[PDB]
From Swiss-Prot, chain A:
Keywords: Acetylation, Methylation, Nucleotidyltransferase, Nucleus, Transferase
Annotated gene: Cmas
Natural source organism: Mus musculus
Class of this enzyme: transferase
Active-site residues annotated for this sequence: R160
Residues of the full protein shown: 40 to 268 of 432
Catalytic activity field: an N-acylneuraminate + CTP = a CMP-N-acyl-beta-neuraminate + diphosphate
UniProt keyword Lipid biosynthesis present: no
Function statement: Catalyzes the activation of N-acetylneuraminic acid (NeuNAc) to cytidine 5'-monophosphate N-acetylneuraminic acid (CMP-NeuNAc), a substrate required for the addition of sialic acid. Has some activity toward NeuNAc, N-glycolylneuraminic acid (Neu5Gc) or 2-keto-3-deoxy-D-glycero-D-galacto-nononic acid (KDN).
Pathway annotation: Amino-sugar metabolism; N-acetylneuraminate metabolism
Recorded consequence of changing P157A: Does not affect the nuclear localization
Name of the protein: N-acylneuraminate cytidylyltransferase
From Swiss-Prot, chain B:
Domain of life according to the entry: Eukaryota
Tissue specificity as recorded in UniProt: Highly expressed in brain and heart, and at intermediate level muscle and liver.
Range within the parent protein: 40 to 267 of 432
Cell compartments where the protein resides: Nucleus
GO cellular component: nucleoplasm; nucleus
Protein name: N-acylneuraminate cytidylyltransferase
Organism: Mus musculus
Pathway noted in the entry: Amino-sugar metabolism; N-acetylneuraminate metabolism
Gene: Cmas
Quaternary context: Homotetramer; the active enzyme is formed by a dimer of dimers.
Entry EC number(s): 2.7.7.43
Length: 229, 228
C-alpha cells in the first residue's frame, strides 16, 4: 500500500521567541506533543521532522522521529509550507502520501489522525485537512480611498441568531494537511478528491492565537494527549 | 448632550450552569469586569445592568451600576438582546444612546469605550459595534448527501496566500454594541450610519470560546482591566 509519512516542519528561527519549536510547553518541547500523537496513531509508515537546527534534530530524535536536514532557504518568513514539503519529498521517493502536521497545534490526538488515514484508505481521498466550526459574524472592511460603509457578510442584522440556531462556518485550524505526492508535486497542498476533517474546538486553538505561552500551557494540559494510559 | 447609557444584560439563566454572569472570574464576579471598564471610561451618563435575579442585582450594585429588574419574557434562553434592550428603554425614555456591553468579554478596557463614544460625536454614527481581525481560510460544508465535496470560499487552493499576502477578515467579537434609540426602536442593533471598532485580539476572547473557565481566568489576569 502507499507510504503515509507524517512530516512536521520545524525551523530554528521562529517568530518572537527564537527556537520556539523546542520550547517547553507544559514541560515538553513543542514538537514533542504532535510527534507523540503521530507515533501513537500507529498509522504512519514513517514520522519525520524537517529542520535546519542541531537542537531541533536532537529533540526530534528523542521523540522517536526521523529527521531530515535542510538549509534556511525554506525557513524564511516569506517561505511556504509547500516549499519545505517538496524539499523533503525530493529526497524520499518511498513517500507516497504526506501527512503534514503543525507543531503549533499541540492538542492533536492520535484518534483523529487514525480516522483521516481511514478516510484516505477507505474512501480513497486524495487530500484531507483539519478544520474547525465557528459561529462568528462577518462584516466588510471600509475600502481604500475611504467611503465608510460596512455590510453584514453573514447574518441579517434585523434578526440576529443565537449560536445554537445555525451551523457556523468551517475554518482551517492549521493542525494537519494530508496530501498525495502527485498533488504536492503539482503545487496543491489540497486538491483532487478533497475533504476536510472537523476537529473539536478544544484541540483547535493555535499557540500563536492564544497569545500567551502559559495560557497555552494551561490549554494543552487540559486538552492535550499525554501518551499511553 | 445626548444621554449615553451603558447596558449590561445579565440574566440568571445561562445555557447550562446558571448565574455564570455572577460566577467569580479571577476573584471577581463576571459582570464586575465589564462594569469596571464602563465606569472608569467616564463617558456614560449612566451605567445599567438588566437582570431578573436578586443575586445579580446585588453584585451589580456593589460595582456601582444601576439595576433594572427585567421581565421574565426577555430573560429566556431564546430571548434576543434586542428584545431585552427594547424592554429596558421602555423604562428610560431619557436614554438616547445604548452602549450594550457583554459580560462574556471581560477583557474590555475603558480606552476602547471612550474612543467609540467619540466616534459617535465627530463622525456622528447611529451604530458602532466591536470587531476583530482574523486570518482563517473558510471552506464549504458538505450537505445534500451523495459524494458531496467541500469548496474554498475564501482562497484559491492552487495559490494559498501568506499572512502578508493578504488582510484577514473582520468578525464581531461580542464585546459591545452601541446604538441610538431610533435604531433600537425600529429593531436594529446595527444600522443607519454604521461603523465597526477593531479591538486587539488579546481583548476579544469570549468566555464560551476558551471553554475551560479557568483558562479565561488566566486570560483576564494577563489581559484584563483591573480598575484603579
Ligand atoms: C448582541 C447579541 O446578539 N449578543 C448575543 C451573542 C453574540 O452573537 C456573540 O457575543 C457574538 O458572536 O451570542 C449569544 O451569547 P450569550 O447567550 O452568551 O449572551 C451574551 C450575554 O448577554 C446576556 N443576555 C442576552 C440576551 C438576553 N435577552 N438577556 C441576557 O441576559 C447573557 O446573560 C450573556 O451573558 C449566544 O447566541 O450564545 C446571544 C447574545 O444575545
Amino acid at each position: 500500500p502507499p507510504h503515509l509519512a507524517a512530516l512536521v516542519l520545524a525551523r530554528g528561527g521562529s517568530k518572537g521567541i527564537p527556537l520556539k519549536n523546542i520550547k517547553r510547553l507544559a514541560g515538553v518541547p513543542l514538537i514533542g506533543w504532535v510527534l507523540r500523537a503521530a507515533l501513537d496513531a500507529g498509522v504512519f509508515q514513517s514520522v519525520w521532522v524537517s529542520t535546519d537546527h542541531d537542537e531541533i534534530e536532537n529533540v526530534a530524535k528523542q521523540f522517536g522521529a526521523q529527521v531530515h536536514r535542510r538549509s534556511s532557504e525554506t525557513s524564511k518568513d516569506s517561505s511556504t509550507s509547500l516549499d519545505a514539503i517538496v524539499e523533503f519529498l525530493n529526497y524520499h521517493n518511498e513517500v507516497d502520501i504526506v501527512g503534514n502536521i503543525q507543531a503549533t497545534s499541540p492538542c492533536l490526538h492520535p484518534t483523529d489522525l487514525q480516522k483521516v488515514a481511514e478516510m484516505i484508505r477507505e474512501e480513497g481521498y486524495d487530500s484531507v485537512f483539519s478544520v474547525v466550526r465557528r459561529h462568528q459574524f462577518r462584516w466588510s472592511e471600509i475600502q481604500k480611498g475611504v467611503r465608510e460603509v460596512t455590510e453584514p457578510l453573514n447574518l441579517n442584522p434585523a434578526k440576529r441568531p443565537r449560536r445554537q440556531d445555525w451551523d457556523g462556518e468551517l475554518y482551517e485550524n492549521g493542525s494537519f494537511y494530508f496530501a498525495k505526492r502527485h498533488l504536492i508535486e503539482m503545487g496543491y497542498l489540497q486538491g483532487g478528491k478533497m475533504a476536510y476533517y472537523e476537529m473539536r474546538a478544544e484541540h483547535s486553538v493555535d499557540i500563536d492565537v492564544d497569545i500567551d505561552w502559559p495560557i497555552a500551557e494551561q490549554r494543552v494540559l487540559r486538552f492535550g494527549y499525554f501518551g499511553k494510559e
